[PDB]
Design a protein around this ligand. Structure first.
Ligand SMILES: NC(=O)c1ccc[n+]([C@@H]2O[C@H](COP(=O)([O-])OP(=O)(O)OC[C@H]3O[C@@H](n4cnc5c(N)ncnc54)[C@H](O)[C@@H]3O)[C@@H](O)[C@H]2O)c1
Ligand SMILES: NC(=O)c1ccc[n+]([C@@H]2O[C@H](COP(=O)([O-])OP(=O)(O)OC[C@H]3O[C@@H](n4cnc5c(N)ncnc54)[C@H](O)[C@@H]3O)[C@@H](O)[C@H]2O)c1
Ligand SMILES: NC(=O)c1ccc[n+]([C@@H]2O[C@H](COP(=O)([O-])OP(=O)(O)OC[C@H]3O[C@@H](n4cnc5c(N)ncnc54)[C@H](O)[C@@H]3O)[C@@H](O)[C@H]2O)c1
Ligand SMILES: NC(=O)c1ccc[n+]([C@@H]2O[C@H](COP(=O)([O-])OP(=O)(O)OC[C@H]3O[C@@H](n4cnc5c(N)ncnc54)[C@H](O)[C@@H]3O)[C@@H](O)[C@H]2O)c1
Ligand SMILES: NC(=O)c1ccc[n+]([C@@H]2O[C@H](COP(=O)([O-])OP(=O)(O)OC[C@H]3O[C@@H](n4cnc5c(N)ncnc54)[C@H](O)[C@@H]3O)[C@@H](O)[C@H]2O)c1
Lengths: 310, 311, 310, 314, 310
């Protein structure tokens, strides 16, 4: 479903982290909705921890690929040969093994700045993925510009990306997107770091039993992969730089998932064991015409068929 | 046997992966059939897993060699000094130890793109080896453009090669060749990844007994190394880019091998042990490259068998 | 609190080791006190030993970051793209794991010389951190120019920094600052190498018991992080190169800390187990208008609230 | 003993693998016989397998050395600063640990091509060491151009060197020399890969007993290090590229060594051992004589005789 | 004590291996005797085997340092930025762990040639350290040009240095100095490879007992560090290239040390356990005006006070 009535006729779209969850979904959206645009996906491609990209997420991709590591000078230098009109920077490190603090900064921030430089020279608009992690454990709703107190390097690295584009808001049109607990197709290969809806839904379908921490009633703003996609494409029409929250702007408990899940998968065991996010989405709507569809229900509904692929 | 009535008189032919199975066979074909052409073979040469090229496969080669690693910038930069008219890209990674996903892509795809760039600048026609692996476990017959759902990185990497040349069909004349279970001389050093005909034929000749999975009646389109060669040389007359299936277009069971094998090696034990089906849709290849495979599993096993006797 | 009535309006301030103790504190001072100045922090960012920088020390930073390793030619080359007016070189190696002698010299001295070269070309004033370690075990008070007999590589490396700027006092305005046992907020992540006031105060607050070597009456010139900050900002108005001692110029025993500590945290155990520094601060005062506030008391007082964050 | 009546007065001679057996002997020959020529020896210098070069082989060398690895771009780039008139490429890998196939090709062939390129640009004549290994187990006599079927990478790599210069016979004057079982002074440090005459003569002198495979009557064309030297110096007057066999052109059994050896060292034990397993080499030397004026002296006898005094250095 | 009545007023002196024994002593000589000259010391600085340089040997150095590895292209390339008038090449590998043959050649010879190239371009006179090791076990006296049959790589590498400068005697003024068993202050950190006078004198002062091989009456030409220094400074006035022996030209047995030692430290045990060098110094005297003072006696005498620093 087109999110902008632009043909993107002779445009070249570069998606880094294209073998990953959002990157691959995004690449497919353009493939199906703007068949005239050139979609080129770039990715390191699963190093095994570290990069959890996977060719399985690109199974029906008819565009082109670039096997590259954004930290590799040679690869970046070669990337300058490519003429692209847009850059959707989705490539980053898996929080799973985010051990070393210096390395998370290298690939999540340092590498980013370099892509910014290349995009600016090519006067290609930039749309990048930030994170709701920039807020750390602060009071919800989470508003951009307020209480961004990361609790881990990964969250901090993302904050640095934003603090940078904000400081350089006129170097080029650069739009940061802070995602909040995204779920949907193609997140399976993120392994243990795949969404809880994917986690729960799978435990239910498998062991017919599902584990969940202390009452699992903690609230997270779950945004469906489709709305995240809408955000990226809407963002490419931005005539000014900025960083926006991108969630459904409605928090839901892990229990409500289990619930909406039972309402589909029937009943299952709810074994326990012994933070609050909600996207303030106003400016996003205001600036990007963003308008999320898919609440946890519409989301879990649309996603569930794929989850059945067992 | 000439597959094109061209002399290839002052042409320089570059064959990457020339120390490997098809590359070495190909190099010899040109050597014997187009003696006027300059055949230059390039290869990393067996690193031990990884590259399974082997000088034994070039024992009677009178042309020239280039010891190089296609992933090595210095080697590639040095390769630009060479003026070649054709590039047969056969160099790739052994599915045997295809462990790391990032590395398969580096050498099978990234390295490929760079060769593409060099060939284009030198305006040298490109003929490269793809794989039937791009189809994964989909319904046979396998048609280019349909149901290409790789199941492993190796298959995917090959698909990326094709998806690229198709997107750049006018940058230069680039012809991809999707091989299906190739067998024939010089595949011995591929070790455990050598064709089943070579595997079975050897077990029979040795232990007089042969193992084989669940009834071994699964069908594979076995194409003899000679037809693969025909495909490459026919492909060098292509005036347009494209990717083609290259098999015999006739599936055969592992049992039919055992059969055609007993019909030669006499009888032997058929021990078993406890979901794919390939068959090349070859129409476009015929149509575009004048490809016409000879050698059915019988003619193939027949012609191959004498060499297999070298024990 | 402004330490100079300069607006620093369109100035760019580069702080290396900005993710560390003094660097992060310094970056915040400029942020809060000279909001018009551009504060750019650079750091390797904790490699795990080695670099003990930590994003936690930059939690409220609104300026920009540079993920870089001063020993990396590529990073340094990229750094030349940045136009900065001042360089506060705080980046150095953690004495904790200062094992290899060659490596301490590389990052503490060799890397320093290169920054000197870059700053000189950019005609940017240089203010760097030296150490009271240059004096080794010599008679106190410790006077710059006298009895600088390092006892370890780290101390020596710092000495080389000074012996160099002194030899090149006219290449650019380069000011070295020899710190003496600094304490205060944001030194927690220095782990085992964090100040004794932080060490003792934590043992007291936790185990209600505190260990301390042979009578712990050995004297150290403890200087509060705030005075160190005063020193750096005062130093940026220097019109001539030089190296200065920066302490409170008043030695205090580890017992006096325990004392001033009990006077706050109540009583606690003083278990034992079986060098003398005092900054000669005259020239510093004379040349930089340096005037330390915060004695061990005012220091421990102001610091203690933060230490309570447990 | 001069092998050419040329003074080589202001010539610079570059010998790669100069810390090795033939390279070091060669460097000494020029030192003693053409004292006006500049002899510069280049070598990696024993990495420990791999490179078995050793400073002991250059003990009386008054010329100059270049510590370099021919596979190292930086070293090769620095080598271009040197102006040399001749290049004697003796540097190669020890068959002893020739494990990895890719690596033998890198240093024995790839590295060679680059030296060829540098020599060509400097218009310096090239004389390189090939091997009788290019023939593998084929019928003797071994003739250049016929039955070159290597059995190992090392032999293949050498063949590639030749197939290349032959394809590029006019790029510069490049002369390949296929050595057959060379023996003589300065091969001791090749360890286990030192000639059988050195091996046997040492076992005899030590344990007074000598081991030897299946009857040890298999024939090898043993060429004395001195004739190899004659070949290189004669080769530097070649006005055309080419690859030549360089042996004595007369095969001898390992027993004849033991024999010529007893005739000197007195008697000793001759213990055998068993474990198709056949090879037979004999250099067809005609073209070499024809083109290089090569004329080998030293039969196994004259060879073992002249060599034996040095072997006594125990 | 000045060894040349030249002021060396605006000269820049580069000493490699400056953190080592002779290099550090040399650097101090110029510091004290030619205060007008710029003394810059370069060293890798103890990697732990390998490089046994140590900052302790530069404790009172007021000149400048360069942390560099002569085998590192980047460091050598950076070194070209420095304008120096003289190069005293003292840096080399410790015979102690001289295991790999290829590596000794790399740093002792290959790295040397590169320094030769840089010095030649800068038209800076070169004075380098060779060794009496070039003679191996040949008949004494040891004459330059005769019987140089090294027995180890280290000795050979040194020989190559000389055979090179001799072949290139007109490329620049390059003077090689073949030292013979040098002893004196600042050799302590050479550990087990420190002079026998230092070894014996320490065993005597400590365990009051001293070990010594087969009768310890083997003769070595022991030259005091001060005469070695005289040789280097006299060498910098050479107007022609050449390689010279630099010893006292008088062999002495290890027993004579024990003797001259007892004559000072009183008596001690002489426990045993089960080559001959003598520098032919004529050409050195003739060409460099070299005239050694300090026989084993004057040497042991002058050195002994320092050895007392225990
Ligand atoms: N819950 C969420 O999914 C969520 C929340 C907040 C922010 N984000 C951000 O959205 C973006 C995409 O996340 P995702 O869900 O797709 O994760 P993902 O791991 O599925 O996709 C990211 C891709 O980056 C690739 N990559 C990693 N290192 C690379 C390198 N050095 N060079 C090239 N490619 C490299 C990985 O292989 C992977 O394919 C990120 O920037 C991520 O931090 C996601
Ligand atoms: N059954 C088959 O034979 C079959 C089936 C499908 C596809 N293919 C394709 O055919 C082509 C060749 O197959 P093959 O049977 O010759 O396999 P092979 O193992 O012989 O590979 C050919 C050569 O590639 C060389 N090589 C690998 N990496 C290299 C590198 N980085 N640099 C230089 N050389 C390198 C190896 O040394 C080997 O000599 C490939 O593109 C392969 O994917 C073959
Ligand atoms: N804290 C004291 O009392 C004291 C005493 C004497 C001297 N000093 C000196 O003051 C300066 C700052 O000390 P600190 O208390 O901030 O120590 P710190 O270790 O907390 O901070 C130093 C920062 O430098 C960073 N760094 C290290 N190597 C780097 C590299 N290669 N590239 C980029 N960044 C790198 C570290 O990660 C850290 O963030 C140093 O030069 C230190 O030696 C401090
Ligand atoms: N019987 C024989 O001795 C025989 C027979 C046939 C061919 N050959 C050939 O003769 C030539 C010399 O043989 P050799 O007897 O001197 O053996 P050798 O062991 O002495 O090897 C010669 C030298 O090559 C040097 N070298 C190896 N790799 C190097 C590198 N990367 N860079 C620089 N130097 C390197 C070795 O260190 C050694 O000094 C070769 O080309 C060899 O293959 C010898
Ligand atoms: N001291 C003696 O008895 C004696 C005798 C004969 C020759 N020599 C020669 O005199 C010179 C100095 O000897 P020394 O007694 O001072 O030994 P030393 O080890 O004290 O001095 C050598 C210096 O070279 C430095 N160095 C080593 N490798 C380096 C590298 N890669 N880059 C930069 N610096 C490096 C070491 O750190 C050390 O500081 C040498 O050339 C040595 O071989 C000394």
């Amino acid at each position: 479903m087109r999110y902008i009535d632009d043909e993107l006729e002779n445009q070249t779209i570069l998606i880094t982290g294209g073998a990953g969850f959002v990157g691959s979904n995004l690449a497919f959206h353009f493939q199906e909705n703007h068949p005239k645009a050139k979609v080129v996906v770039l990715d390191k491609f699963r190093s095994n921890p570290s990069s959890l990209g996977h060719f399985k997420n690109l199974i029906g991709f008819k565009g082109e690929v670039i096997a590259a590591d954004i930290n590799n000078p040679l690869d970046l230098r070669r990337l300058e040969k490519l003429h692209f009109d847009y850059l959707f920077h989705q490539a980053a490190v898996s929080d799973t093994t985010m051990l070393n603090q210096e390395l998370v900064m290298k690939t999540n921030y340092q590498a980013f700045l370099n892509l910014l430089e290349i995009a600016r020279s090519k006067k290609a608009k930039v749309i990048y993925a930030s994170s709701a992690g920039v807020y750390g454990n602060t009071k919800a709703p989470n508003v951009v510009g307020k209480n961004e107190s990361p609790e881990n390097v990964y969250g901090f690295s993302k904050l640095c990306m934003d603090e940078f584009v904000l400081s350089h808001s006129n170097d080029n049109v650069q739009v940061g997107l802070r995602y909040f607990n995204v779920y949907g197709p193609r997140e399976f290969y993120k392994e243990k770091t795949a969404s809880m809806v994917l986690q729960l839904a799978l435990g239910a379908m498998a062991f017919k039993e599902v584990k969940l921490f202390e009452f699992g009633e903690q609230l997270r703003d779950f945004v469906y992969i489709e709305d995240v996609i809408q955000a990226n494409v809407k963002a490419m029409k931005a005539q000014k730089s900025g960083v926006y929250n991108v969630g459904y702007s409605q928090a839901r408990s892990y229990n409500e998932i289990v619930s909406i899940l039972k309402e589909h998968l029937g009943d299952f065991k709810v074994t326990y064991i012994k933070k609050h996010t909600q996207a303030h989405i106003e400016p996003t709507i205001l600036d990007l015409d963003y308008t999320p569809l898919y609440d946890l229900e519409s989301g879990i509904k649309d996603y569930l068929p794929h989850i059945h692929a067992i």
